[PDB]
Amino acid sequence: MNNYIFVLSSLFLVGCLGLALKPSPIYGGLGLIVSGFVGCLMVLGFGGSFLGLMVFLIYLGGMLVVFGYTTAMATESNWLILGFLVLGVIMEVFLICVLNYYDEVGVINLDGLGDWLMYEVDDVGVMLEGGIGVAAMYSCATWMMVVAGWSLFAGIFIIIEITRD
Amino acid sequence: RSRAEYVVTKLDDLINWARRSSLWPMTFGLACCAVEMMHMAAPRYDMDRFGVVFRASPRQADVMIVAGTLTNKMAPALRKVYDQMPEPRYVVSMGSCANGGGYYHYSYSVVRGCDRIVPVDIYVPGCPPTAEALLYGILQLQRKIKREQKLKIWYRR
Amino acid sequence: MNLYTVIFINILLSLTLILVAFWLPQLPFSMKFFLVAITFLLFDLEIALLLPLPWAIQTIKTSTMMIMAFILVTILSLGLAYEWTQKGLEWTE
Amino acid sequence: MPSTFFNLTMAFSLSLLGTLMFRSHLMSTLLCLEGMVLSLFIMTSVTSLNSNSMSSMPIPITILVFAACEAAVGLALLVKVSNTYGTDYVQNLNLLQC
Amino acid sequence: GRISAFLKNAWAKEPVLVVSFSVWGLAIIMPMISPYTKYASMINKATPYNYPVPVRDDGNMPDVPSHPQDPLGPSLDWLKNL
Amino acid sequence: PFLDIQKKLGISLDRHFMFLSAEQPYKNAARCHAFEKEWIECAHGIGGTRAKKECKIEFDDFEECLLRYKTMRRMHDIKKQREKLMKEGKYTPPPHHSGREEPRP
Amino acid sequence: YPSKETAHWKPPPWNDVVTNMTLNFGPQGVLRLVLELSG
Amino acid sequence: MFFINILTLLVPILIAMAFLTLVERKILGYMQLRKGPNIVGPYGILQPFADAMKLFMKEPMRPLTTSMSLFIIAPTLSLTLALSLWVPLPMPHPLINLNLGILFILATSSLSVYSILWSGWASNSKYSLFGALRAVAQTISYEVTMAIILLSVLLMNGSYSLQTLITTQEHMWLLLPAWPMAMMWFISTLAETNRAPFDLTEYAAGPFALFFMAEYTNIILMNALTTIIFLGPLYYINLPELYSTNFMMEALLLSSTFLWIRASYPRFRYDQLMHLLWKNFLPLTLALCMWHISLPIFTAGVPPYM
Amino acid sequence: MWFEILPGLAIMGVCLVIPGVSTAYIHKFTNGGKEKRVARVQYQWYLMERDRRISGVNRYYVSKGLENID
Ligand SMILES: CCCCCCCCCCCCCCCCCC(=O)OC[C@H](COP(=O)([O-])OCC[N+](C)(C)C)OC(=O)CCCCCCCCCCCCCCCCC
Ligand SMILES: CCCCCCCCCCCCCCCCCC(=O)OC[C@H](COP(=O)(O)OCCN)OC(=O)CCCCCCCCCCCCCCCCC
Ligand code: SF4
């Protein structure tokens, strides 16, 4: 259960590798959805559920909905991408193995897998979950709040102006 | 007989019971007979109570009720819709037009019976036959597909 | 571990259902859909901004939080009013 | 955490290399762009949660919102390309050479 | 007159926008009117999510109490009587 | 920054959440708050070059707290030596490290 | 400088410058509708 | 014991789904002056089982041009999202207690609209793709209005938990403070479940049965969610069976209300549905969202964190 | 008549009685006649771990009162 986060990170790397290998855009969006779910799982494993549910509710929830929608109004095989994907995953296994043995405990350590996921946590305490600071954006970072709001308002104006035709 | 054939017969009973209890038609409805079809759908006779669901898509259909006059302009459409329907499919022709041309038998633009286009399981006679009689035809179809022994034939292969 | 077990059981049940379902029998683009899709993107990110309000309601400086939330929902209303006035909400040639 | 952060940086590098090596699909290019965006979100969120930086957990929300509006702009541009050329092929976009 | 007629026949033909705009205006104005607006901030301040760290006194300050069961300090009798 | 409108008007639009030891919601201290505070207290008022030259001890302590590279090296060395003594068999784990100990609150 | 690898180019223009749905309504069934749609 | 609890949650939900199909047939028949199925079984109780067995027994007409990957993925995804939607629900105690269960619910609905979009793109027909785009736009717009409505009513509640909602509801129903929100939430759940008058309506046998199962499961879940949020059942710490029974009764009335609405009303137009949402709900939703932002501030009724 | 639908109502009502009641009963059985203690915060999780360490059988629900104090 200590290799859970590393397995998730490897799955994210595999999904990003396939997305870079660029299949048909529907399958590319499917791989991006899988990578988004995996990134949600990593964020939930590392900490508060709020940022993970932003990934799972806003990134997965809306953004790739609109990617899939826009791909659906678009149009497009050759099956080579699966061949480079299996070649890439066996090369990835070989590369993480050779990096694991060669750097001793550097970026990758076999014995250190799962030992350094949670560094320090406040065992006794309320007000520690991930949504509290993002809510403090309403109070502490009003400049963040207003630049995000102005970004969305200007984005509305931009989008209708571009698609006005 | 052998114990395996008893289990095969019971499996045939279960499958045939499922297929006759859940009989979803699309009515390839043309005419007078399609009006009488929806009078069978009407609350008096209640094929929905019988397990027969009104207004199903041809992709979800089990039996095609050929209701009306099949013309030469409509016969390719009939054959195409029959081909789109999945493999466990039956055909109930209803009315003299779909049976043998009927009152337009000697017409230049009328197919003399829909059996020239699609294989008809059961013919319902009348012009129009009553909704009572069409429901008779549907129950006769349920009895007919109850009589099927597919795993028995496969075991005796 | 519990949620992992339940999601695995859910996926396994659905997969075995589709497996028994198989084993048992033996262009003309429209601009307006893209418009409502991007309008959903903008409103959904504005939801992402609005979502931490159950924890932002507990702050000491309730006036500043209230002012920011009021301004934000006001610019939601203003953007929707813009799109309504410039006919991005109807389906008409 | 260092192994998973290294994996995230290699995921970003792979997505960047996929962005830099174009194929026929501008949709695939935009998908690689959001591969980079998603990798950035996970690295920022894991860094904030590891450092317990509650003041800077709004930064993932801001990168998500800003990159999503940027990709909405890019999707609108791809819609314009698909409308003018029938398809979204990037080799149709080449008459500004002269 | 004309403005009153405009709101009147607007309420006649479509009340959705009228109700939404009136609810908007009420949400603007009612925090500026009700006397309970400050009490939300007072309650949020009084809610003790963190440990109150004791202070090492030199005896020059008499306002801080030595005991929690003392008359000195910010009591919440207003909260009990709210 | 390139322009100092925030410093001229005295406002703090984005200067109050620059680092980990800044203002935090409900006084929740970030990791290495003391180390970063020590580094900033050393480095303030002497410039970047003198901060790099003179506050190197404080910066190295803060970086070691933030990254735990030497901690990972030490723990990996301990675990590798313990695994070697497992392999040659001249050492046994104690009851408290084997999961059988009397718990304390 | 018209070379062999660039002589095919043309100068830019001075000013820098209906696909519709042909639906077949039908078996909802003795009606055929060739229906011409703009969205 | 946990796997036993998993089984005794999921299996009765599927039984409720099948008998929801049966009771829809019976209620629609009796509202149309006829009967439901009663021949198949003693009183029709074997009719959903016969329907499911026929649907799994009929061969699936699988076109070769359709992508087998998406054709596999869409119905299995839709069913597993219906069950994952069901798991974090307290009745009054859940199988799994999530900190942000309502966010989990909404994002699972987002994955469901992935499922319908993937099914529509896999169905190789231009009319099917057009109807798929229309259905995704419908589901998406009613999802954004659900998210804003639910955000405001939990601004009244206090957190994204559901036991916090039970503690909120233990004195009165949330229908009285948030009844226009309740009406818009009910309409939004209707248009998520694609029930009449918002149905606006490809797959044969197996996948069709899976989609039918998941849609009816989502219908029961939208009813249960509306019950838990807006109409609080009676909760007592010494007995939870009263809460379970009362939640049961209100969920059955809300399911009957969906079947009631389908019987009573003709379906909407696509332009009329988008017009209704984007011109009547979302203005009211935003106005009431800011009103429910303002309400605890000027009433000092800010809810606790727990 | 209209009461013929009440068989289906009874089946659905029963099979929504099973999930919540069964969940509560299984929680009480697995935690010793008490509700499943929820840890929404690190403080509550720390309390659970403290009870698990005090109880001496590696189960948190075995609560110890004054019998452990002389
Ligand atoms: C949660 C428990 C269950 C609740 C629901 C129970 C079942 C009810 C079922 C009814 C049938 C529904 C079937 C589908 C119908 C679809 C059509 C439909 O509903 O259209 C909506 C219709 C649409 O109206 P329309 O179609 O006429 O269009 C309006 C636009 N014009 C006229 C220009 C064309 O109504 C609405 O959109 C209104 C929604 C309700 C708003 C209620 C506001 C009340 C007041 C607000 C607060 C004000 C005071 C604030 C505080 C002040 C304090 C001092
Ligand atoms: C056919 C292909 C289908 C592909 C898509 C599959 C979708 C499945 C259905 C939707 C599942 C959604 C899961 C979303 C993530 C969990 C959300 C959440 O809130 O997680 C946090 C929660 C604990 O957080 P909290 O509530 O704060 O608790 C602490 C307080 N006591 O809980 C946790 O921390 C638990 C962490 C894990 C939770 C997710 C488990 C996923 C299991 C793997 C699924 C894929 C398996 C591999 C592929 C199988 C074949 C397809
Ligand atoms: S058989 Fe008679 S009733 Fe039926 S379609 Fe022909 S003319 Fe009409």
Side-chain angles (χ1 to χ4, degrees):
Chain A
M1 280 123 96
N2 313 298
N3 298 11
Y4 170 71
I5 310 288
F6 182 86
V7 164
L8 281 176
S9 66
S10 296
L11 277 173
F12 188 73
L13 183 54
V14 164
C16 278
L17 165 65
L19 188 56
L21 272 178
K22 278 197 208 62
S24 179
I26 285 291
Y27 304 86
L30 194 140
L32 192 40
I33 283 149
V34 168
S35 296
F37 196 45
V38 160
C40 182
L41 291 196
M42 293 183 286
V43 173
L44 295 158
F46 269 104
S49 296
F50 193 60
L51 299 174
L53 275 156
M54 293 296 172
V55 162
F56 182 75
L57 183 50
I58 320 295
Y59 192 56
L60 292 182
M63 180 76 237
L64 316 176
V65 175
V66 168
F67 270 94
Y69 210 98
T70 300
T71 308
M73 285 155 288
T75 179
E76 91 264 17
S77 179
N78 76 17
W79 287 54
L80 288 177
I81 297 89
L82 277 296
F84 318 105
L85 184 54
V86 295
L87 184 58
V89 71
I90 62 170
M91 183 177 176
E92 160 176 343
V93 166
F94 169 71
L95 185 62
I96 66 164
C97 279
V98 67
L99 280 158
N100 189 359
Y101 293 104
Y102 266 70
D103 68 355
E104 61 87 20
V105 55
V107 286
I108 293 187
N109 185 21
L110 188 47
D111 282 338
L113 274 180
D115 291 331
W116 313 103
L117 290 164
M118 294 299 291
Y119 279 26
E120 183 178 1
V121 67
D122 186 15
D123 306 313
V124 55
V126 185
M127 296 297 108
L128 306 168
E129 62 86 20
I132 295 160
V134 176
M137 182 179 72
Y138 276 89
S139 68
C140 288
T142 44
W143 193 242
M144 292 284 81
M145 200 63 274
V146 300
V147 298
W150 184 258
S151 179
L152 283 145
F153 198 64
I156 291 178
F157 276 64
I158 286 163
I159 283 302
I160 295 89
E161 182 65 26
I162 286 173
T163 61
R164 183 180 63 83
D165 171 72
Chain B
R1 76 276 192 192
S2 177
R3 186 68 181 178
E5 293 179 353
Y6 174 77
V7 184
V8 161
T9 308
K10 292 295 122 178
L11 281 183
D12 291 331
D13 291 331
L14 189 59
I15 297 169
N16 293 327
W17 171 87
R19 292 180 181 177
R20 69 196 164 85
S21 297
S22 199
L23 206 56
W24 294 356
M26 61 79 70
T27 301
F28 182 76
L30 278 296
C32 320
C33 280
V35 168
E36 183 66 26
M37 183 279 289
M38 64 184 73
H39 285 284
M40 186 189 84
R44 169 159 301 182
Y45 301 110
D46 215 356
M47 66 182 179
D48 191 9
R49 164 188 96 91
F50 276 90
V52 171
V53 175
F54 181 75
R55 285 284 191 271
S57 180
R59 278 313 290 261
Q60 286 85 61
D62 305 350
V63 64
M64 185 180 288
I65 297 169
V66 190
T69 306
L70 180 75
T71 59
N72 296 350
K73 202 172 205 163
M74 196 64 175
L78 165 76
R79 192 56 209 206
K80 182 174 72 68
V81 171
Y82 174 76
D83 286 327
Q84 296 294 321
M85 173 177 312
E87 190 276 331
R89 53 192 178 208
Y90 316 105
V91 171
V92 175
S93 164
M94 169 184 52
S96 296
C97 285
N99 279 353
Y103 200 36
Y104 318 99
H105 183 95
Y106 301 107
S107 181
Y108 52 87
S109 84
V110 169
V111 185
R112 277 154 275 280
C114 69
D115 45 349
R116 284 172 184 241
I117 301 299
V118 290
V120 175
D121 275 16
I122 281 180
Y123 303 80
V124 178
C127 177
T130 73
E132 183 66 25
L134 179 56
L135 183 62
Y136 188 77
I138 301 299
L139 294 199
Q140 181 148 275
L141 177 69
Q142 303 190 327
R143 275 180 261 116
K144 175 181 183 293
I145 62 170
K146 177 196 198 151
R147 277 197 326 261
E148 298 184 1
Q149 39 183 54
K150 295 191 145 73
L151 283 174
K152 182 175 174 66
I153 291 301
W154 171 85
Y155 189 81
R156 282 198 326 199
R157 281 284 173 91
Chain C
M1 215 68 184
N2 278 11
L3 185 54
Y4 181 33
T5 299
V6 178
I7 297 312
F8 206 54
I9 282 298
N10 279 356
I11 291 174
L12 191 143
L13 185 54
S14 296
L15 278 182
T16 61
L17 268 193
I18 207 69
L19 283 189
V20 65
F22 280 160
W23 177 248
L24 189 57
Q26 207 83 7
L27 306 178
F29 183 103
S30 179
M31 185 54 90
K32 293 182 183 293
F33 297 114
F34 185 72
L35 268 169
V36 65
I38 308 300
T39 314
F40 163 68
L41 280 184
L42 296 144
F43 272 72
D44 175 322
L45 298 155
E46 283 153 330
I47 294 172
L49 296 187
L50 277 171
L51 272 168
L53 270 170
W55 303 281
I57 193 66
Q58 313 270 312
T59 187
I60 320 291
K61 293 187 286 185
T62 61
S63 63
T64 311
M65 183 278 288
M66 182 179 72
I67 286 167
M68 295 298 102
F70 280 15
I71 283 177
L72 188 153
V73 181
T74 313
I75 70 173
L76 275 295
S77 65
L78 277 182
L80 178 67
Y82 189 16
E83 182 158 350
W84 198 341
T85 50
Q86 303 288 120
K87 293 187 286 185
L89 294 185
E90 293 83 3
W91 311 81
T92 304
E93 61 86 20
Chain D
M1 214 216 56
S3 64
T4 62
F5 211 89
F6 171 81
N7 273 319
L8 282 167
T9 61
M10 299 285 111
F12 184 90
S13 301
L14 275 180
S15 302
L16 175 61
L17 188 153
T19 300
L20 289 157
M21 293 177 70
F22 263 85
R23 284 207 62 186
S24 289
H25 276 313
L26 192 64
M27 199 42 78
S28 292
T29 300
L30 299 193
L31 287 172
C32 291
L33 292 174
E34 302 267 354
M36 302 198 290
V37 175
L38 172 59
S39 313
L40 283 165
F41 196 106
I42 321 305
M43 300 177 294
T44 311
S45 308
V46 175
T47 313
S48 309
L49 289 160
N50 187 236
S51 58
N52 306 354
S53 194
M54 294 177 71
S55 57
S56 70
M57 294 184 286
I59 301 299
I61 301 299
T62 70
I63 63 170
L64 187 63
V65 176
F66 273 106
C69 309
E70 183 178 1
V73 160
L75 282 175
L77 283 177
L78 189 149
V79 167
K80 297 296 289 183
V81 182
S82 197
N83 260 342
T84 177
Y85 279 135
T87 54
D88 74 15
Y89 292 165
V90 298
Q91 71 260 18
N92 273 309
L93 311 163
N94 59 344
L95 73 164
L96 268 173
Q97 53 161 351
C98 55
Chain E
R2 196 180 194 273
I3 305 302
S4 72
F6 164 51
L7 282 71
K8 189 175 183 296
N9 64 7
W11 174 252
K13 65 178 72 66
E14 61 86 20
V16 173
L17 294 174
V18 176
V19 171
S20 60
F21 266 90
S22 66
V23 159
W24 184 87
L26 269 191
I28 301 299
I29 62 170
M30 294 299 291
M32 293 180 183
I33 301 299
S34 83
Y36 284 126
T37 313
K38 60 183 184 293
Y39 276 127
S41 299
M42 293 177 71
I43 282 164
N44 281 350
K45 185 183 286 185
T47 309
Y49 293 99
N50 284 315
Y51 192 85
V53 184
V55 288
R56 171 203 295 264
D57 66 322
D58 62 358
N60 286 323
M61 65 182 179
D63 62 358
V64 59
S66 85
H67 208 273
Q69 286 178 352
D70 282 349
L72 285 75
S75 76
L76 314 179
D77 300 348
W78 55 270
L79 183 49
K80 291 174 70 175
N81 290 318
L82 203 61
Chain F
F2 179 75
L3 282 192
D4 291 331
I5 297 89
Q6 296 177 0
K7 288 193 67 61
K8 181 182 183 57
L9 309 174
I11 68 184
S12 176
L13 292 188
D14 75 346
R15 308 149 60 189
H16 52 283
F17 47 91
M18 185 64 72
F19 39 79
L20 318 175
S21 59
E23 176 75 31
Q24 291 280 314
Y26 309 99
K27 306 308 159 197
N28 277 318
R31 260 189 52 243
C32 318
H33 157 85
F35 286 102
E36 177 166 78
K37 189 210 93 77
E38 278 305 282
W39 183 36
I40 298 309
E41 286 286 327
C42 187
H44 177 269
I46 70 184
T49 316
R50 279 189 57 208
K52 193 169 181 174
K53 271 287 186 49
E54 308 191 43
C55 303
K56 192 180 166 55
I57 297 281
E58 271 92 345
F59 168 67
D60 291 331
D61 291 331
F62 165 67
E63 188 180 5
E64 178 54 39
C65 180
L66 200 57
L67 277 296
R68 304 295 183 148
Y69 278 136
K70 294 166 72 177
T71 300
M72 278 166 218
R73 292 288 335 269
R74 213 184 153 79
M75 185 63 72
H76 166 74
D77 287 337
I78 297 196
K79 287 182 90 181
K80 193 175 183 177
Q81 194 65 221
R82 184 180 67 161
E83 193 80 52
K84 199 180 85 71
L85 273 70
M86 294 298 102
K87 253 163 65 194
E88 65 183 1
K90 56 168 56 59
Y91 168 70
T92 187
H96 39 270
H97 277 116
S98 66
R100 301 163 293 108
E101 77 281 350
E102 318 283 338
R104 53 177 325 165
Chain G
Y1 297 110
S3 72
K4 268 188 177 179
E5 280 273 335
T6 195
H8 308 143
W9 293 1
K10 300 286 98 175
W14 319 107
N15 52 354
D16 268 349
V17 174
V18 188
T19 48
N20 282 340
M21 294 298 291
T22 317
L23 183 63
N24 277 37
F25 182 76
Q28 63 181 9
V30 70
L31 158 67
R32 192 151 306 160
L33 283 181
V34 176
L35 183 63
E36 183 66 25
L37 281 73
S38 166
Chain H
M1 218 55 191
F2 173 58
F3 178 62
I4 296 184
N5 189 179
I6 287 176
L7 278 182
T8 192
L9 169 82
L10 281 71
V11 188
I13 287 312
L14 301 173
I15 300 178
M17 177 273 296
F19 279 79
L20 177 70
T21 69
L22 162 66
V23 66
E24 182 188 343
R25 297 268 285 276
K26 291 210 75 63
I27 289 174
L28 263 69
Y30 274 94
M31 272 168 166
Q32 289 153 6
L33 211 72
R34 43 177 198 84
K35 293 182 181 177
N38 49 18
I39 298 183
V40 182
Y43 272 137
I45 79 181
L46 286 184
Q47 172 72 238
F49 300 135
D51 285 331
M53 185 179 288
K54 192 266 297 182
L55 276 178
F56 278 92
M57 186 66 204
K58 198 171 195 77
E59 62 89 20
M61 168 72 177
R62 308 158 287 134
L64 197 145
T65 51
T66 290
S67 315
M68 294 298 102
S69 64
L70 298 190
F71 191 84
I72 280 298
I73 276 170
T76 187
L77 180 68
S78 182
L79 183 65
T80 192
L81 295 161
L83 304 185
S84 313
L85 269 169
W86 272 96
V87 65
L89 270 189
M91 294 182 286
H93 290 99
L95 178 53
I96 286 165
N97 196 19
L98 289 186
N99 268 18
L100 304 176
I102 279 161
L103 295 196
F104 180 76
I105 291 281
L106 298 171
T108 317
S109 289
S110 298
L111 295 174
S112 76
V113 66
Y114 290 169
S115 74
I116 190 167
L117 169 66
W118 272 339
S119 75
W121 202 75
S123 178
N124 195 4
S125 166
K126 179 63 178 175
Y127 190 66
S128 77
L129 187 61
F130 194 58
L133 292 180
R134 293 178 66 188
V136 182
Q138 183 178 2
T139 306
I140 281 300
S141 300
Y142 283 86
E143 183 178 1
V144 59
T145 192
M146 293 177 71
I148 307 181
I149 279 153
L150 200 43
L151 182 62
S152 313
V153 68
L154 281 71
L155 266 171
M156 185 179 288
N157 169 50
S159 71
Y160 294 90
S161 179
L162 293 154
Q163 294 82 17
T164 310
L165 261 172
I166 295 180
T167 318
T168 284
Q169 294 270 61
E170 66 91 20
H171 272 168
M172 65 179 288
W173 283 4
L174 274 189
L175 170 74
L176 298 101
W179 60 267
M181 293 177 70
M183 302 174 69
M184 294 182 286
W185 163 268
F186 201 69
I187 299 305
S188 306
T189 46
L190 269 161
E192 293 293 328
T193 45
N194 292 306
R195 299 294 295 163
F198 316 105
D199 62 358
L200 279 72
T201 52
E202 45 180 358
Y203 279 0
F208 177 74
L210 266 292
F211 265 107
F212 212 86
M213 284 193 150
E215 166 167 334
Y216 276 64
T217 309
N218 287 325
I219 286 151
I220 310 181
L221 186 141
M222 295 296 172
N223 290 138
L225 214 64
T226 304
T227 292
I228 290 168
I229 294 157
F230 284 97
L231 322 169
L234 274 297
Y235 178 59
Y236 288 101
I237 198 73
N238 46 0
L239 73 165
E241 303 90 17
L242 184 78
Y243 190 94
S244 291
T245 310
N246 190 359
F247 155 80
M248 182 277 288
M249 274 154 42
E250 288 161 71
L252 268 295
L253 276 296
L254 289 179
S255 304
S256 303
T257 309
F258 290 171
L259 321 173
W260 200 353
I261 288 172
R262 169 187 205 171
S264 296
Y265 300 125
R267 89 182 45 95
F268 264 97
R269 209 159 62 209
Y270 177 68
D271 49 28
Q272 289 176 4
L273 182 141
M274 299 281 81
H275 278 172
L276 159 74
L277 187 143
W278 294 94
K279 304 185 176 181
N280 309 126
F281 272 19
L282 203 49
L284 280 176
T285 310
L286 285 180
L288 287 165
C289 176
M290 215 201 305
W291 171 256
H292 283 272
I293 285 161
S294 177
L295 183 70
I297 300 303
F298 89 97
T299 53
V302 175
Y305 176 63
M306 283 74 74
Chain I
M1 295 299 291
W2 66 270
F3 43 72
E4 294 294 328
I5 298 169
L6 277 296
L9 276 296
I11 301 299
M12 293 177 70
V14 160
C15 72
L16 281 71
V17 175
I18 295 90
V21 174
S22 58
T23 312
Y25 280 171
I26 291 168
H27 286 303
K28 291 174 70 175
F29 176 71
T30 47
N31 289 304
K34 299 164 304 181
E35 278 176 322
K36 184 177 180 180
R37 183 177 292 171
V38 298
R40 293 182 184 272
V41 289
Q42 288 276 356
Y43 178 79
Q44 289 161 340
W45 174 246
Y46 177 55
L47 288 201
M48 293 177 70
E49 289 279 88
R50 208 192 156 274
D51 290 293
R52 187 178 65 82
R53 282 189 305 254
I54 300 299
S55 70
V57 300
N58 212 0
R59 284 85 170 93
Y60 78 101
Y61 45 77
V62 192
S63 303
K64 301 303 218 323
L66 276 299
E67 64 277 26
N68 263 337
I69 292 185
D70 58 309

